[PDB]
Amino acid sequence: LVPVYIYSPEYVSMCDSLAKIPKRASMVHSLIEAYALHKQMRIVKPKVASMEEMATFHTDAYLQHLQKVSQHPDSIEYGLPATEGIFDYAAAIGGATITAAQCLIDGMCKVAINWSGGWHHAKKDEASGFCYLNDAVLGILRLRRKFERILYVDLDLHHGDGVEDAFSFTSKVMTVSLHKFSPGFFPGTGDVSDVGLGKGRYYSVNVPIQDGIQDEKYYQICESVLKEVYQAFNPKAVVLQLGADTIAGDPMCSFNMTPVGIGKCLKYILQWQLATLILGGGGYNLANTARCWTYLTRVILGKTLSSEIPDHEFFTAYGPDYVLEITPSCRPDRNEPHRIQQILNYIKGNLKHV
Numbered sequence: 490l491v492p493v494y495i496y497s498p499e500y501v502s503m504c505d506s507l508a509k510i511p512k513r514a515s516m517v518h519s520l521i522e523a524y525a526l527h528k529q530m531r532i533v534k535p536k537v538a539s540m541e542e543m544a545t546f547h548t549d550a551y552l553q554h555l556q557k558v559s560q561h562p563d564s565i566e567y568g569l570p571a572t573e574g575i576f577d578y579a580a581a582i583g584g585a586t587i588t589a590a591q592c593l594i595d596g597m598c599k600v601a602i603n604w605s606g607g608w609h610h611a612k613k614d615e616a617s618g619f620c621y622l623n624d625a626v627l628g629i630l631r632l633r634r635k636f637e638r639i640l641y642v643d644l645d646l647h648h649g650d651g652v653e654d655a656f657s658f659t660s661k662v663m664t665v666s667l668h669k670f671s672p673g674f675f676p677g678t679g680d681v682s683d684v685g686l687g688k689g690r691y692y693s694v695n696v697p698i699q700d701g702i703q704d705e706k707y708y709q710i711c712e713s714v715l716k717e718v719y720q721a722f723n724p725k726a727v728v729l730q731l732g733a734d735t736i737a738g739d740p741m742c743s744f745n746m747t748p749v750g751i752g753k754c755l756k757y758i759l760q761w762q763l764a765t766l767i768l769g770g771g772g773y774n775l776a777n778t779a780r781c782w783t784y785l786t787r788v789i790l791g792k793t794l795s796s797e798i799p800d801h802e803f804f805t806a807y808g809p810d811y812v813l814e815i816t817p818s819c820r821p822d823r824n825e826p827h828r829i830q831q832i833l834n835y836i837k838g839n840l841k842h843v
Protein backbone atom coordinates (compact mmCIF):
# COMPACT_ATOMS: atom_id res chain seq x y z
CA LEU A 490 0.00 0.00 0.00
CA VAL A 491 2.68 2.48 -1.06
CA PRO A 492 1.21 5.26 -3.24
CA VAL A 493 1.38 5.16 -7.02
CA TYR A 494 2.87 8.31 -8.59
CA ILE A 495 1.99 8.53 -12.29
CA TYR A 496 5.12 9.92 -13.89
CA SER A 497 7.47 9.55 -16.82
CA PRO A 498 9.86 12.14 -18.29
CA GLU A 499 8.11 11.98 -21.67
CA TYR A 500 4.77 12.62 -19.96
CA VAL A 501 5.98 15.63 -17.96
CA SER A 502 7.70 16.85 -21.12
CA MET A 503 4.45 16.43 -23.03
CA CYS A 504 2.42 18.27 -20.37
CA ASP A 505 4.94 21.02 -19.65
CA SER A 506 4.07 22.15 -23.21
CA LEU A 507 0.35 22.61 -22.50
CA ALA A 508 -0.03 26.18 -23.63
CA LYS A 509 -1.96 27.58 -20.66
CA ILE A 510 0.36 26.11 -17.98
CA PRO A 511 3.95 26.35 -19.38
CA LYS A 512 6.35 24.05 -17.49
CA ARG A 513 3.88 23.49 -14.63
CA ALA A 514 4.24 19.71 -14.91
CA SER A 515 8.04 19.95 -14.59
CA MET A 516 7.82 22.54 -11.79
CA VAL A 517 5.50 20.21 -9.84
CA HIS A 518 7.57 17.04 -10.35
CA SER A 519 10.90 18.80 -9.78
CA LEU A 520 9.67 20.27 -6.51
CA ILE A 521 8.32 16.84 -5.54
CA GLU A 522 11.62 15.15 -6.45
CA ALA A 523 13.89 17.82 -4.92
CA TYR A 524 12.14 16.89 -1.67
CA ALA A 525 12.78 13.21 -2.54
CA LEU A 526 9.07 12.45 -2.16
CA HIS A 527 9.24 10.21 -5.24
CA LYS A 528 11.39 7.75 -3.28
CA GLN A 529 8.43 6.96 -1.01
CA MET A 530 6.20 6.06 -3.95
CA ARG A 531 5.85 3.37 -6.60
CA ILE A 532 6.40 5.21 -9.89
CA VAL A 533 4.20 3.97 -12.76
CA LYS A 534 4.61 5.13 -16.35
CA PRO A 535 1.29 6.15 -17.92
CA LYS A 536 -0.23 4.45 -20.91
CA VAL A 537 -1.73 6.61 -23.64
CA ALA A 538 -5.52 6.44 -23.80
CA SER A 539 -6.79 4.01 -26.44
CA MET A 540 -9.47 5.29 -28.74
CA GLU A 541 -11.95 2.73 -27.39
CA GLU A 542 -11.01 3.98 -23.93
CA MET A 543 -11.65 7.62 -24.77
CA ALA A 544 -14.92 6.75 -26.54
CA THR A 545 -16.32 5.28 -23.30
CA PHE A 546 -17.24 8.89 -22.58
CA HIS A 547 -16.58 11.05 -25.63
CA THR A 548 -18.41 10.51 -28.91
CA ASP A 549 -16.62 9.08 -31.93
CA ALA A 550 -17.60 12.14 -34.00
CA TYR A 551 -15.93 14.48 -31.50
CA LEU A 552 -12.96 12.12 -31.01
CA GLN A 553 -12.70 12.06 -34.81
CA HIS A 554 -12.69 15.81 -35.21
CA LEU A 555 -10.28 16.56 -32.38
CA GLN A 556 -7.73 14.13 -33.82
CA LYS A 557 -8.08 15.55 -37.35
CA VAL A 558 -7.70 19.26 -36.48
CA SER A 559 -4.74 18.19 -34.32
CA GLN A 560 -2.84 17.03 -37.46
CA HIS A 561 -11.09 25.04 -39.50
CA PRO A 562 -14.78 24.77 -40.72
CA ASP A 563 -16.58 22.32 -38.39
CA SER A 564 -14.51 23.27 -35.29
CA ILE A 565 -17.02 25.75 -33.80
CA GLU A 566 -19.63 23.00 -33.26
CA TYR A 567 -17.28 21.18 -30.86
CA GLY A 568 -15.92 24.35 -29.25
CA LEU A 569 -12.49 24.53 -30.83
CA PRO A 570 -7.94 26.52 -29.92
CA ALA A 571 -6.91 23.64 -32.23
CA THR A 572 -3.16 23.20 -31.57
CA GLU A 573 -0.91 20.84 -33.55
CA GLY A 574 -0.81 17.74 -31.35
CA ILE A 575 -3.72 18.62 -29.03
CA PHE A 576 -5.23 15.15 -29.51
CA ASP A 577 -1.97 13.50 -28.44
CA TYR A 578 -1.62 15.50 -25.21
CA ALA A 579 -5.30 14.96 -24.43
CA ALA A 580 -4.95 11.20 -24.93
CA ALA A 581 -1.76 11.03 -22.87
CA ILE A 582 -3.32 12.82 -19.87
CA GLY A 583 -6.38 10.60 -20.31
CA GLY A 584 -4.35 7.39 -20.28
CA ALA A 585 -2.44 8.68 -17.25
CA THR A 586 -5.65 8.96 -15.25
CA ILE A 587 -6.88 5.59 -16.55
CA THR A 588 -3.48 4.05 -15.68
CA ALA A 589 -3.93 5.31 -12.12
CA ALA A 590 -7.52 4.03 -11.81
CA GLN A 591 -6.31 0.66 -13.15
CA CYS A 592 -3.61 0.37 -10.46
CA LEU A 593 -6.32 1.00 -7.86
CA ILE A 594 -8.44 -1.73 -9.49
CA ASP A 595 -5.51 -4.20 -9.31
CA GLY A 596 -5.05 -3.59 -5.56
CA MET A 597 -1.59 -2.27 -6.48
CA CYS A 598 -2.08 0.80 -4.30
CA LYS A 599 -4.72 2.49 -2.21
CA VAL A 600 -3.81 5.98 -3.49
CA ALA A 601 -2.80 6.78 -7.07
CA ILE A 602 -1.72 10.25 -8.14
CA ASN A 603 -1.84 11.98 -11.56
CA TRP A 604 -1.14 15.65 -10.71
CA SER A 605 -1.30 16.51 -14.43
CA GLY A 606 -4.95 15.38 -14.57
CA GLY A 607 -8.23 17.00 -13.59
CA TRP A 608 -9.62 18.55 -16.80
CA HIS A 609 -13.14 18.59 -15.47
CA HIS A 610 -14.92 20.94 -17.90
CA ALA A 611 -14.99 18.82 -21.08
CA LYS A 612 -18.40 17.49 -22.18
CA LYS A 613 -18.94 14.34 -24.20
CA ASP A 614 -18.92 16.11 -27.58
CA GLU A 615 -17.59 19.54 -26.66
CA ALA A 616 -14.34 21.05 -25.50
CA SER A 617 -14.85 23.57 -22.72
CA GLY A 618 -12.77 25.64 -20.32
CA PHE A 619 -9.47 24.64 -22.00
CA CYS A 620 -10.40 20.96 -21.51
CA TYR A 621 -10.42 18.70 -24.57
CA LEU A 622 -10.74 15.31 -22.84
CA ASN A 623 -12.45 14.72 -19.51
CA ASP A 624 -9.85 12.45 -17.96
CA ALA A 625 -11.66 12.55 -14.60
CA VAL A 626 -14.79 11.01 -16.14
CA LEU A 627 -12.54 8.55 -17.98
CA GLY A 628 -10.93 7.56 -14.68
CA ILE A 629 -14.30 7.12 -12.97
CA LEU A 630 -15.55 4.92 -15.83
CA ARG A 631 -12.51 2.72 -15.35
CA LEU A 632 -13.16 2.55 -11.61
CA ARG A 633 -16.74 1.39 -12.33
CA ARG A 634 -15.22 -1.97 -13.41
CA LYS A 635 -14.73 -2.95 -9.75
CA PHE A 636 -16.49 -0.29 -7.64
CA GLU A 637 -20.27 0.14 -7.62
CA ARG A 638 -20.44 3.62 -6.08
CA ILE A 639 -17.78 6.26 -6.67
CA LEU A 640 -17.58 9.65 -4.94
CA TYR A 641 -16.07 12.48 -6.98
CA VAL A 642 -14.89 15.41 -4.81
CA ASP A 643 -13.94 18.55 -6.77
CA LEU A 644 -12.06 21.31 -4.89
CA ASP A 645 -11.06 23.47 -7.88
CA LEU A 646 -12.06 27.12 -7.87
CA HIS A 647 -14.47 26.32 -10.71
CA HIS A 648 -17.50 24.09 -10.92
CA GLY A 649 -16.71 20.62 -12.19
CA ASP A 650 -19.63 20.84 -14.61
CA GLY A 651 -18.28 18.30 -17.12
CA VAL A 652 -18.00 15.47 -14.61
CA GLU A 653 -21.35 16.34 -13.05
CA ASP A 654 -22.89 16.37 -16.53
CA ALA A 655 -21.51 12.93 -17.35
CA PHE A 656 -23.30 11.31 -14.40
CA SER A 657 -26.15 13.72 -13.60
CA PHE A 658 -28.67 10.99 -14.48
CA THR A 659 -27.15 8.16 -12.41
CA SER A 660 -26.99 7.16 -8.75
CA LYS A 661 -23.81 5.08 -9.06
CA VAL A 662 -21.56 8.20 -9.13
CA MET A 663 -22.14 11.17 -6.82
CA THR A 664 -20.44 14.45 -7.72
CA VAL A 665 -19.49 16.99 -5.04
CA SER A 666 -18.06 20.35 -6.14
CA LEU A 667 -16.99 23.30 -3.95
CA HIS A 668 -16.47 26.27 -6.24
CA LYS A 669 -16.84 29.99 -6.61
CA PHE A 670 -20.39 30.75 -7.77
CA SER A 671 -21.16 34.27 -8.94
CA PRO A 672 -23.02 35.72 -11.93
CA GLY A 673 -20.51 36.01 -14.73
CA PHE A 674 -18.02 33.58 -13.24
CA PHE A 675 -17.08 30.55 -15.35
CA PRO A 676 -18.73 28.21 -15.98
CA GLY A 677 -21.77 29.81 -14.37
CA THR A 678 -23.45 26.54 -13.24
CA GLY A 679 -23.44 24.60 -9.99
CA ASP A 680 -25.78 26.38 -7.63
CA VAL A 681 -26.93 24.52 -4.51
CA SER A 682 -30.19 24.02 -6.46
CA ASP A 683 -28.35 21.95 -9.10
CA VAL A 684 -28.82 18.38 -7.83
CA GLY A 685 -29.05 16.29 -11.00
CA LEU A 686 -31.79 14.77 -13.11
CA GLY A 687 -34.08 11.73 -13.11
CA LYS A 688 -32.57 8.69 -11.42
CA GLY A 689 -29.56 10.85 -10.52
CA ARG A 690 -31.58 13.53 -8.75
CA TYR A 691 -29.94 14.38 -5.35
CA TYR A 692 -26.67 12.80 -6.49
CA SER A 693 -25.01 16.02 -7.58
CA VAL A 694 -23.94 18.13 -4.60
CA ASN A 695 -22.97 21.75 -5.25
CA VAL A 696 -21.47 24.08 -2.61
CA PRO A 697 -21.48 27.63 -4.03
CA ILE A 698 -18.89 29.87 -2.32
CA GLN A 699 -17.95 33.55 -2.52
CA ASP A 700 -14.61 35.35 -2.76
CA GLY A 701 -12.05 35.52 0.02
CA ILE A 702 -12.79 32.32 1.95
CA GLN A 703 -9.83 31.03 3.98
CA ASP A 704 -8.55 27.75 5.38
CA GLU A 705 -10.60 27.23 8.57
CA LYS A 706 -14.08 28.04 7.20
CA TYR A 707 -13.33 26.18 3.95
CA TYR A 708 -12.57 23.06 5.96
CA GLN A 709 -15.62 23.34 8.24
CA ILE A 710 -17.81 23.51 5.12
CA CYS A 711 -15.96 20.73 3.28
CA GLU A 712 -16.02 18.48 6.33
CA SER A 713 -19.69 19.16 7.06
CA VAL A 714 -20.74 18.27 3.52
CA LEU A 715 -18.37 15.30 3.20
CA LYS A 716 -19.37 13.87 6.58
CA GLU A 717 -23.04 13.70 5.56
CA VAL A 718 -22.24 12.52 2.01
CA TYR A 719 -20.27 9.62 3.46
CA GLN A 720 -23.22 8.41 5.52
CA ALA A 721 -25.86 8.95 2.84
CA PHE A 722 -23.82 7.69 -0.11
CA ASN A 723 -21.33 5.15 1.31
CA PRO A 724 -18.91 5.20 -1.65
CA LYS A 725 -16.41 2.45 -2.29
CA ALA A 726 -13.92 4.56 -4.30
CA VAL A 727 -13.06 8.28 -4.45
CA VAL A 728 -11.76 10.52 -7.25
CA LEU A 729 -10.45 13.83 -5.89
CA GLN A 730 -9.81 16.92 -8.03
CA LEU A 731 -7.46 19.30 -6.19
CA GLY A 732 -6.95 22.23 -8.54
CA ALA A 733 -4.75 24.92 -7.04
CA ASP A 734 -6.51 28.03 -8.42
CA THR A 735 -8.08 28.51 -4.99
CA ILE A 736 -4.70 29.31 -3.37
CA ALA A 737 -3.64 32.82 -2.38
CA GLY A 738 -1.41 34.34 -5.03
CA ASP A 739 -3.34 32.79 -7.93
CA PRO A 740 -4.11 35.22 -10.78
CA MET A 741 -7.76 34.15 -10.37
CA CYS A 742 -7.53 36.07 -7.09
CA SER A 743 -10.83 34.76 -5.73
CA PHE A 744 -10.46 32.37 -2.81
CA ASN A 745 -7.81 32.98 -0.15
CA MET A 746 -6.75 29.41 0.62
CA THR A 747 -3.42 27.87 1.58
CA PRO A 748 -2.44 24.25 0.87
CA VAL A 749 -2.91 23.43 4.58
CA GLY A 750 -6.67 24.01 4.32
CA ILE A 751 -6.89 21.91 1.17
CA GLY A 752 -4.63 19.35 2.84
CA LYS A 753 -7.00 19.04 5.80
CA CYS A 754 -9.85 18.21 3.41
CA LEU A 755 -7.63 15.61 1.78
CA LYS A 756 -6.65 14.19 5.16
CA TYR A 757 -10.30 13.84 6.15
CA ILE A 758 -10.91 11.96 2.89
CA LEU A 759 -7.83 9.74 3.19
CA GLN A 760 -9.16 8.61 6.57
CA TRP A 761 -12.02 6.74 4.82
CA GLN A 762 -9.43 4.07 3.85
CA LEU A 763 -11.04 3.77 0.39
CA ALA A 764 -9.38 3.56 -3.00
CA THR A 765 -8.60 7.16 -3.98
CA LEU A 766 -7.68 8.83 -7.28
CA ILE A 767 -5.74 12.07 -6.83
CA LEU A 768 -5.89 14.61 -9.67
CA GLY A 769 -4.79 18.21 -10.20
CA GLY A 770 -6.55 20.83 -12.32
CA GLY A 771 -6.33 24.60 -12.29
CA GLY A 772 -3.49 26.55 -10.76
CA TYR A 773 -2.03 29.54 -12.57
CA ASN A 774 0.58 30.63 -10.07
CA LEU A 775 3.08 28.01 -11.13
CA ALA A 776 5.27 27.92 -8.03
CA ASN A 777 2.31 28.14 -5.62
CA THR A 778 0.71 25.22 -7.43
CA ALA A 779 4.01 23.39 -7.21
CA ARG A 780 4.02 24.24 -3.48
CA CYS A 781 0.45 23.05 -3.01
CA TRP A 782 0.67 19.67 -4.69
CA THR A 783 4.10 19.01 -3.15
CA TYR A 784 2.53 19.66 0.25
CA LEU A 785 -0.53 17.56 -0.61
CA THR A 786 1.81 14.72 -1.66
CA ARG A 787 3.50 14.93 1.74
CA VAL A 788 0.06 14.81 3.38
CA ILE A 789 -0.65 11.61 1.46
CA LEU A 790 2.71 10.24 2.57
CA GLY A 791 2.40 11.49 6.14
CA LYS A 792 6.01 12.75 5.98
CA THR A 793 7.41 16.09 7.17
CA LEU A 794 9.13 18.76 5.10
CA SER A 795 11.42 21.65 5.87
CA SER A 796 10.13 25.08 4.94
CA GLU A 797 13.01 26.25 2.75
CA ILE A 798 12.54 25.39 -0.92
CA PRO A 799 15.36 23.00 -1.87
CA ASP A 800 17.88 24.01 -4.48
CA HIS A 801 16.64 22.69 -7.82
CA GLU A 802 15.82 23.62 -11.42
CA PHE A 803 13.16 26.23 -10.62
CA PHE A 804 14.34 27.69 -7.29
CA THR A 805 14.43 31.21 -8.75
CA ALA A 806 10.64 31.14 -9.30
CA TYR A 807 9.96 30.82 -5.55
CA GLY A 808 10.42 34.47 -4.60
CA PRO A 809 10.22 36.38 -2.36
CA ASP A 810 10.78 34.25 0.72
CA TYR A 811 11.78 30.96 -1.00
CA VAL A 812 9.72 28.88 1.43
CA LEU A 813 7.04 26.22 0.94
CA GLU A 814 4.50 28.22 2.98
CA ILE A 815 1.93 30.43 1.24
CA THR A 816 0.63 33.45 3.16
CA PRO A 817 -3.01 34.56 2.70
CA SER A 818 -3.70 37.97 1.17
CA CYS A 819 -5.19 40.83 3.19
CA ARG A 820 -8.54 40.52 1.41
CA PRO A 821 -12.10 40.31 2.72
CA ASP A 822 -13.92 37.01 3.10
CA ARG A 823 -17.24 37.72 1.37
CA ASN A 824 -19.08 34.65 2.75
CA GLU A 825 -22.07 35.59 4.95
CA PRO A 826 -22.12 32.80 7.58
CA HIS A 827 -25.91 32.52 7.19
CA ARG A 828 -25.85 32.07 3.41
CA ILE A 829 -23.29 29.32 4.06
CA GLN A 830 -25.50 27.70 6.71
CA GLN A 831 -28.59 27.74 4.48
CA ILE A 832 -26.50 26.04 1.79
CA LEU A 833 -25.46 23.37 4.27
CA ASN A 834 -29.11 23.02 5.34
CA TYR A 835 -30.43 22.68 1.79
CA ILE A 836 -27.71 20.06 1.04
CA LYS A 837 -28.60 18.06 4.14
CA GLY A 838 -32.20 18.05 2.94
CA ASN A 839 -31.04 16.91 -0.49
CA LEU A 840 -28.89 14.18 1.07
CA LYS A 841 -31.62 12.74 3.30
CA HIS A 842 -33.28 11.66 0.02
CA VAL A 843 -30.27 9.36 -0.57
Ligand SMILES: CN(C)c1ccc(C(=O)NCCCCCCC(=O)NO)cc1
Binds near residue numbers: 618619646648732770
Ligand atom coordinates in the same frame (compact mmCIF):
# COMPACT_ATOMS: atom_id res chain seq x y z
C1 LIG B 1 -5.62 36.71 -19.18
N1 LIG B 1 -6.53 36.03 -20.09
C2 LIG B 1 -6.29 36.12 -21.52
C3 LIG B 1 -7.57 35.30 -19.61
C4 LIG B 1 -7.79 35.19 -18.24
C5 LIG B 1 -8.86 34.44 -17.77
C6 LIG B 1 -9.71 33.80 -18.66
C7 LIG B 1 -10.87 32.99 -18.14
O1 LIG B 1 -11.08 32.90 -16.93
N2 LIG B 1 -11.67 32.38 -19.01
C8 LIG B 1 -12.83 31.59 -18.61
C9 LIG B 1 -12.37 30.14 -18.59
C10 LIG B 1 -11.85 29.76 -17.21
C11 LIG B 1 -11.40 28.31 -17.18
C12 LIG B 1 -10.24 28.13 -16.21
C13 LIG B 1 -9.85 26.66 -16.18
C14 LIG B 1 -10.03 26.07 -14.80
O2 LIG B 1 -9.31 26.40 -13.86
N3 LIG B 1 -11.01 25.17 -14.70
O3 LIG B 1 -11.26 24.56 -13.48
C15 LIG B 1 -9.50 33.91 -20.02
C16 LIG B 1 -8.43 34.66 -20.50
Ligand SMILES: [K+]
Binds near residue numbers: 643646
Ligand atom coordinates in the same frame (compact mmCIF):
# COMPACT_ATOMS: atom_id res chain seq x y z
K1 LIG C 1 -14.70 22.54 -7.56
Ligand SMILES: [K+]
Binds near residue numbers: 658663
Ligand atom coordinates in the same frame (compact mmCIF):
# COMPACT_ATOMS: atom_id res chain seq x y z
K1 LIG D 1 -24.67 11.66 -10.22
Ligand SMILES: [Zn+2]
Binds near residue numbers: 645646732734770772
Ligand atom coordinates in the same frame (compact mmCIF):
# COMPACT_ATOMS: atom_id res chain seq x y z
ZN1 LIG E 1 -10.23 25.90 -12.08
